[PDB]
Amino acid sequence: EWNDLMRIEGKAKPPKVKGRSQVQPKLVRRQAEWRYSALTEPFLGSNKLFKVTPVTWEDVQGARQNELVLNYQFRTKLNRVSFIDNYVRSVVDDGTGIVRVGWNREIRKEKQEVPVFSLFPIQTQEQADALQQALQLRTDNPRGYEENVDEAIKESVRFFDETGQATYAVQTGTTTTEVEVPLANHPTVEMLNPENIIIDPSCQGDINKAMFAIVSFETCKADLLKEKDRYHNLNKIDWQSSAPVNEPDHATTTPQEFQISDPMRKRVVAYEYWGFWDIEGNGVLEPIVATWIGSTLIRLEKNPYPDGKLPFVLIPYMPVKRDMYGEPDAELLGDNQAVLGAVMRGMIDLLGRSANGQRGMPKGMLDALNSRRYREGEDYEYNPTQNPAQMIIEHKFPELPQSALTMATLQNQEAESLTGVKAFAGGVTGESYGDVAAGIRGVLDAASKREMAILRRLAKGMSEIGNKIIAMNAVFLAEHEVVRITNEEFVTIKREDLKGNFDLEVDISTAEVDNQKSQDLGFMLQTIGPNVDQQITLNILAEIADLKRMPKLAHDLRTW
């Protein structure tokens, strides 16, 4: 119903009459149209999306790694702008937004020749010199080690890593081996249509207390075959004949008459069950995931992600107390829209039904010849009894009453008062989002604070999504991937500590926050005596240089 009010469909549509208008101006769409672009912009103001801040002093390196990797993932593996636009538009239009967070992985084996090396003890000083140069290059620059060291020295260094003794290697021959090459290893976030997902109704207004959640999606057999081990029992489901997509409950934008001839690329609707179940029967609830297509159960296992919660994030637009869902603006504005539309239609009917351009001429004022002369466009003579200045009538538009304009103005004022959105005002709330940026001593009119509150509600959802992705990255990504992305030493996070988010904090990064942080760093540099400690000053300068987007200068000041 709320969407129908927005788009002018269903009950919102004006009735159709043969001789009268059906013009309905769009109020709710307008009020939402300013709100969208007001809200989207803060998330697109900078090149980096996520800001990770260490909680304690050991956490600087971990925060730097996680910020680097998370920013790289969001910048490369996703279309950030489209995701942000859909997220904001859905939150505004439906009153709530469900985000599904998952992981994507596809592994293909290959055969390549790997040379076989025979070890030999380190002889003389030259072998040790070359080995030490290799180790030093590995410490200073991992990419240089990968690209320029060569294979035999790499094998010697690996054996030195395994055992203290150093050796020198000479190749003998090449033997074929099988290697796993990951084509795709990246998290995926995708917004969900509300009609798809069903949540436990007995959660009493909190997503955490929910027992189960069921989501229905479209999938093709290639997706199921990407990871063979996870799914069992795929032969019973037909993949050859049935080619409508017609499952009623599932709601989708796919055209109805469209299916691929190829059996493997055919799409079938599947269901998932994320929830808690008593697997051992002794009263301990544990998370599980299940999947079934039609009437066949293909997948059954525990929750794979380290977090241990359902992979869904729920955000309300305008909250209702003690309830999951939210409310949009259309609920308040339906009646104002209806009355404004009625007024405008009446105005247009008044103008349209009238006669315009018609000329009425009295009988007997002009005889035949003078009538023809008048109609042709030349001079004439009229009977003196009747005065053609007053008697010849040329019709016009009727004059509009003041009631229509007054009522339209009243409706617009009431809509603006309730919602708090005006035509050409506001929108600068995104600049003052950051605490240090302008949240300190920030003065904004009454209307800006409602927009700021909605902005905070969206930023919380972004923080939760980032936290989930960080938790998944801690386990799923390997060491060499992180080293390649960051070019720094890998830091390991113990598996026990994943459940409770320790030592790191996630929030959105904007342009002004970095500027104010630079200002405060310069202030601290002035306040402290620059000659007190060289290392402290170098660390401050490197930190300032990092915010101003100069990696080379920052690294140069760090390793000075």
Partner: protein, 250 residues
């Protein structure tokens, strides 16, 4: 939960029956078996029983080819397994459980068997759900819930060779059984937007308690569960729907 489960099962059965009978009613191409001209002329007695033959299936294939109806499947070239046959059949036909023996007994132009079973070409092909064989250019599918007009043929007398009959107002009449071939992109099931989509079961229930208390029943000890849905079909190309009417053995 038992009552609710039975309610939902009944709803699904009713929906299936309604859709299938609408499809049977709206069928552009109808080919009466035997030498009949309408439902009344269908008979199993006399010189010519109204029972399908190879020529009827060949003519139906020819008509569907002329109407440019797209094919559904692909031919099968057999494997290297002994006693395996190749089948050229590209369309799908739905028959009831009453007609299958007659289809089994049928012979082709040269007197040979015309019903190739599924065990012969189970290898090197795919067997659809409910498939029981393939004849000529048609693969046969058996629908357990298939309907049939009853007491629609001609009058039944003592010369009855054995075909099924039904009683109508004190006199017996022969039954009529269909075989339906739905062509691609022929019909669509219509439905409203707000509240009711095409086939959505809207279930409401009010357990006894405060909410069902009213002036008629001040205390409140009642209840109800209800289930409803919308339906309607639009036929885009009726020339593609095919039907054959015939009697069936007992």
């Amino acid at each position: 939960e038992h009552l609710s489960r039975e309610l939902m099962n009944g709803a699904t059965q009713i929906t299936e029956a309604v859709l299938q009978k609408d499809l049977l009613a709206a069928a552009g191409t109808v080919l009466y078996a035997g030498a009949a001209t309408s439902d009344a002329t269908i008979t199993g007695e006399g010189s010519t029983p109204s029972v399908v033959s190879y020529k009827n299936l060949m003519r139906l294939d020819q008509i569907l080819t002329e109407n440019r109806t797209p094919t559904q499947t692909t031919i099968i070239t057999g494997s290297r397994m002994i006693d395996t046959k190749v089948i050229g059949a590209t369309r799908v036909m739905y028959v009831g459980s009453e007609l299958v023996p007659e289809l089994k007994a049928m012979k082709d132009l040269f007197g040979n068997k015309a019903f190739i079973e599924t065990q012969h070409y189970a290898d090197a092909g795919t067997i659809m759900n409910g498939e029981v064989g393939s004849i000529d250019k048609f693969r046969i599918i058996q629908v357990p819930e298939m309907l049939h007009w009853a007491g629609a043929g001609a009058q039944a007398t003592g010369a009855n060779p054995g075909y099924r009959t039904s009683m109508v107002s004190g006199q017996e009449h022969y039954d009529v059984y269909p075989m339906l071939v739905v062509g691609d992109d022929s019909f669509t099931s219509i439905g409203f937007q707000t509240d009711g989509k095409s086939l959505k079961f809207t279930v409401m229930t009010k357990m006894p308690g405060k909410e069902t208390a009213d002036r008629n029943d001040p205390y409140g000890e009642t209840g109800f569960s209800s289930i409803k849905w919308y339906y309607g079909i639009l036929v885009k190309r009726p020339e593609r729907l095919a039907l054959i009417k015939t009697v069936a053995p007992l």
